[PDB]
Amino acid sequence: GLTEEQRMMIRELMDAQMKTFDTTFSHFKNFRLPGVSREEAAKWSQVRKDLCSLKVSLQLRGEDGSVWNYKPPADSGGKEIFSLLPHMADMSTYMFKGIISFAKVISYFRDLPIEDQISLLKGAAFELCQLRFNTVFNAETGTWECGRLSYCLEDTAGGFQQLLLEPMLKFHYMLKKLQLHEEEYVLMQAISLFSPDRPGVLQHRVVDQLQEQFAITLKSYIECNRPQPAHRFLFLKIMAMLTELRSINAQHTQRALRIQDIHPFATPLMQELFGITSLTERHKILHRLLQE
């Protein structure tokens, strides 16, 4: 029931996803692991609050059948709270490079000016990484299954209710419950990627028209491939989830900047995304990875 142009748009996105999403995480290697004033004190108090909501354990399953498991330390008012940040910095950097490659395969992104390509990727990096993370999230176990690596949420005294307080966790549980198709995920990525209101975008009207066509394709896909009355508001549910993900991005980017200020963890590519010291001069690694 889709136009052929809509069918070709989905084929290009799905082809982009197939070439750039390492679903098994087999090529994620050489990552770090946790080892075997008053205004400054107010900074450390906010950071401790940020790191407490997303507590996870790390399981690494070996080829031989052995299992290494890392339980995080409880907070003792020290730097133990940053134990898993180097590993997560390597994981985030590995995910974003796949995101950069994803966008480059899309023709509409390639035809944009390089400065708008940077602004869009800078604005949607966290969101496309979270959207890809949702497809490997097991809601029954609260575990992100990244091939041999596993990230299991820790049982905070309170259960599901206390975890749902955190907007990041509620997002992953709510998005998983919609049981989306691969095509719907990749259309969510395109809609998030081609956001006209990202800071620094200049071709606003072109990006807005592209986003509209991606959203119309998603709306039309749901009408054609889902039972019509039950999924009558599925598109609007997806759009509300994307709007909430944009809010979570701003909050967590602010969290990341505060942590980076007192404890530097970000990789050089992450520093470009966060704004740490012209768009091309400010983001020289991203420019190179887009010019390849």
- The C-alpha atoms of residue 21 and residue 126 are separated, in whole angstroms, by 15
* Residue 66 touching its own copies (CB under 8 A): yes
Q: What are the backbone dihedrals phi and psi of residue 144, each rounded to the nearest 5 degrees, phi first?
A: -85, 115
Q: CB of 253: closest distance to ligand WU2 in angstroms?
A: 5
- The C-alpha atoms of residue 164 and residue 177 are separated, in whole angstroms, by 14
For residue 164, the partner it binds in ligand WU2, its own copies, none, with Cβ less than 5 to 8 A by kind, is none
Mark 225-254 with x for binding to ligand WU2 (rule: CB under 6 A) and - for no binding.
---------------------------xx-
* Residue 73 touching its own copies (CB under 8 A): yes
For residue 88, the partner it binds in its own copies, ligand WU2, none, with Cβ less than 5 to 8 A by kind, is ligand WU2
Nearest residue (beta carbon) to ligand WU2? 88
Q: CB of 92: closest distance to ligand WU2 in angstroms?
A: 4
Mark 34-63 with x for binding to ligand WU2 (rule: CB under 6 A) and - for no binding.
-----------------x--xxx-------
- Whichever of 118 and 234 has its CB closer to ligand WU2, that residue is 118
- The C-alpha atoms of residue 149 and residue 139 are separated, in whole angstroms, by 16
In the region spanning residues 153 to 182, those forming contacts with ligand WU2, defined by CB under 6 A, are 168
For residue 186, the partner it binds in its own copies, ligand WU2, none, with Cβ less than 5 to 8 A by kind, is none
* Residue 85 touching ligand WU2 (CB under 6 A): yes
Identity (one letter) of the amino acid at 17? Q
Q: What are the backbone dihedrals phi and psi of residue 114, each rounded to the nearest 5 degrees, phi first?
A: -60, -30
Chain centre to alpha carbon of residue 253: 12
Segment contacting ligand WU2 by CB under 6 A, of 27-35, 91-99, 106-114, 280-288: 91-99
CB atoms within 10 A of CB 1: 9
Q: Which of 40, 42, 52, 80 binds its own copies (CB under 8 A)?
A: 80
Q: Of 7, 17, 256, 31, which is closest to residue 131 (Cα–Cα)?
A: 17
For residue 67, the partner it binds in ligand WU2, its own copies, none, with Cβ less than 5 to 8 A by kind, is its own copies
CB atoms within 10 A of CB 37: 6
Three-class secondary structure assignment of 118-184: HHHHHHHHHHHHHHHHHCCEECCCCEEEECCEEEEECCCCCCHHHHHHCHHHHHHHHHHHCCCCHHH
Annotated binding site for hyperforin: 92, 130-133, 252
Identity (one letter) of the amino acid at 89? A
- Residue 212 · residue 192 · CB < 8 Å: no
Q: Which of 193, 222, 256, 259 binds ligand WU2 (CB under 6 A)?
A: 256
What is the rounded radius of gyration, in angstroms, for the C-alpha atoms of the chain? Answer: 20
Q: CB of 168: closest distance to ligand WU2 in angstroms?
A: 5
Structure-token match 């200020």, residue found: 261
- Residue 196 · residue 204 · CB < 8 Å: yes
For residue 56, the partner it binds in ligand WU2, its own copies, none, with Cβ less than 5 to 8 A by kind, is ligand WU2
| Burial class for 44, CB neighbours closer than 10 Å (0-12, 13-18, 19+) | middle
Report the interface residues with its own copies, using CB under 8 A: 33-36, 60, 62-74, 76, 78, 80, 83, 148
Report the interface residues with ligand WU2, using CB under 6 A: 51, 54-56, 84-85, 88-89, 91-92, 96, 125-126, 129, 133, 144, 146, 151, 168, 252-253, 256, 270, 273
